[PDB]
Design a protein around this ligand. Structure first.
Ligand SMILES: Cn1c(=S)c2c(ncn2CCNC(=O)NS(C)(=O)=O)n(C)c1=O
Length: 497
């Protein structure tokens, strides 16, 4: 069978009652809520640009305090020039980035324009797409009129902004205009991800043309017709975590399948981003696995890098309303942009697409057995729990979690352990689980078998967590070999039976 467990049709999904959208101490809203109307471009609030240049807000490229002379005036002069050759664009970007003229490589940008694109596609790029991108970038002070707070470590805070505002900001990131975000050995913003796109232009990987095609598809779409909706970014930091060994909650339902993807088959569900602690990972440099792919096909995710500080162990980032602009095939070395995608998601009463994504970063384990250490299992349980918990929401109102082999592959996670950890965390948060094994049918069967075994025997979250502690002590703590003598799921079956 291609899937096992509860039919996916029985899982809860959004949208199938939001309070009034309003700014407050914990919610920054950058549009006029009284004028928010379906199918209409939102109006920025306030009407006139207001600047904050300090350690708690984004340092805007258009700030009168962005100096070198006015850097914004220099950016305008540099970018309001005809581009007919890729060198023209490199020279323009470097005019206001002189210190990086010998450090930043533009080989991928030159190769994309001169060596990947046919003549007609290159002419379209420099006659239409790039000039339109410049104009929306330079419109920033009329679009993004309200200071954007940094979502700093330990802040529980939300930002709601328009897709149009995000497009203006991302066009600035493409042209590398955000100040104080470039130095390798920086103090300010050292705990924040890269935002400027300069590393997208470097090197000769065959992945870069696919990344550029995916992003130019977005830029062509949102400069041609302004998107009309909103996106919310919420940093969530929890302090009260379950006492996992004493948790009496039962397991929830499971649908597990080796076909499908989180973003296509988990529509309306809480979609997990297998995130780097610097959210978005290598999206605008070299990475191209699950997180980077999602950030490329839903580029509004990328702007989280402008204002989201690196995630601590008890935090996540929740993004609601991003739109899918591209379809793709493959991943990593086989990733290819396929075509433009028309997103058919409904919008909620805040005009946000009904798409909710949570970024939770797994640990990277240099040694396979490290992840069975109780502190490390508890860390991952609490990270998933923070990503799944919605304080103040009834369980009947929570969609299923759509996830998969979180932290596996490069970070060395054990898929069978990580699956059970997510099942326990979802159970504690009172959510069902939809698990995509991405081609691995044996893993599907194994996860299903363990899940049904535990539920039919009515084991609680705590019952299972104590079995994980026993596995560590019996098979991992005093193991001198890189691998344990008995695997986790066999151990659990034997211990219970
Ligand atoms: C879209 N999509 C992808 S592409 C994927 C996936 N499961 C594996 N992949 C391939 C990328 N491989 C990694 O991402 N390994 S990892 C944990 O990120 O470090 N699912 C569930 C998915 O929906």
């Amino acid at each position: 069978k291609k899937w096992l467990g509860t039919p996916i049709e029985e899982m809860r999904r959004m949208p199938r009652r939001l309070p009034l959208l309003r700014p407050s101490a914990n919610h920054t809203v950058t549009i006029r809520v009284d004028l928010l109307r379906a199918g209409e471009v939102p109006k920025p609030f306030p009407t006139h640009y207001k600047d904050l240049w300090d350690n708690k807000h984004v340092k805007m490229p258009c700030s009168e305090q962005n100096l070198y002379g006015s850097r914004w005036e220099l950016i305008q002069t540099a970018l309001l020039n005809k581009f007919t050759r890729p060198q023209n664009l490199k020279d323009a970007i470097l005019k206001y980035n002189v210190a990086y003229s010998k450090k930043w490589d533009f080989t991928a940008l030159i190769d994309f324009w001169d060596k990947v694109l046919e003549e007609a596609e290159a002419q379209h790029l420099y006659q239409s797409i790039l000039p339109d991108m410049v104009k929306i970038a330079l419109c920033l002070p009329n679009i993004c009129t309200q200071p954007i707070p940094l979502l700093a470590a330990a802040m529980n805070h939300s930002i709601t902004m328009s897709q149009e505002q995000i497009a203006s900001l991302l066009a600035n990131a493409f042209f590398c205009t955000f100040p104080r975000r470039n130095a390798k050995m920086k103090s300010e913003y050292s705990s924040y991800p890269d935002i400027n796109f300069n590393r997208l232009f470097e090197g000769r990987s065959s992945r870069k043309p696919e990344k550029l095609k995916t992003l130019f598809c977005y830029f062509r779409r949102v400069t041609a017709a302004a998107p009309t909706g909103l996106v919310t970014f919420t940093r969530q930091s929890l302090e009260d975590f379950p006492e996992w060994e004493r948790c009496e909650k039962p397991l929830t339902r499971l649908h597990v399948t080796y076909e499908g993807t989180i973003e296509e088959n988990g529509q309306g569900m809480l979609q997990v981003d297998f995130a780097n602690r610097f959210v978005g990972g290598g999206v605008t440099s070299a990475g191209l696995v699950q997180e980077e792919i999602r950030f490329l096909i839903n580029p509004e995710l990328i702007i989280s890098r402008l204002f989201t500080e690196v995630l601590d162990h008890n935090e996540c980032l929740i993004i609601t309303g991003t739109e899918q602009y591209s379809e793709y095939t493959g991943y990593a070395e086989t990733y290819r942009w396929s075509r433009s995608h028309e997103d058919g998601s409904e919008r909620d009463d805040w005009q946000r697409r009904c798409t909710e994504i949570v970024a939770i970063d797994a640990l990277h384990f240099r040694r396979y057995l490290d992840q069975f250490v109780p502190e490390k299992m508890r860390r991952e349980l609490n990270k998933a729990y923070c990503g799944f918990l919605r304080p103040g929401v009834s369980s009947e109102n929570l969609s299923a979690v759509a996830t998969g082999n979180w932290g596996c592959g490069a970070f060395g996670g054990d898929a069978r352990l990580k699956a059970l950890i997510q099942i326990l965390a979802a159970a504690a948060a009172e959510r069902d689980v939809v698990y995509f094994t991405f081609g691995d049918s044996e893993l599907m069967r194994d996860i299903y078998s363990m899940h049904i075994f535990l539920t039919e025997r009515k084991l609680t979250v705590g019952d299972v967590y104590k079995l994980l502690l026993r596995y560590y002590n019996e098979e991992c703590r005093n193991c001198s070999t890189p691998g344990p003598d008995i695997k986790l799921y066999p151990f659990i079956y034997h211990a219970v039976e």
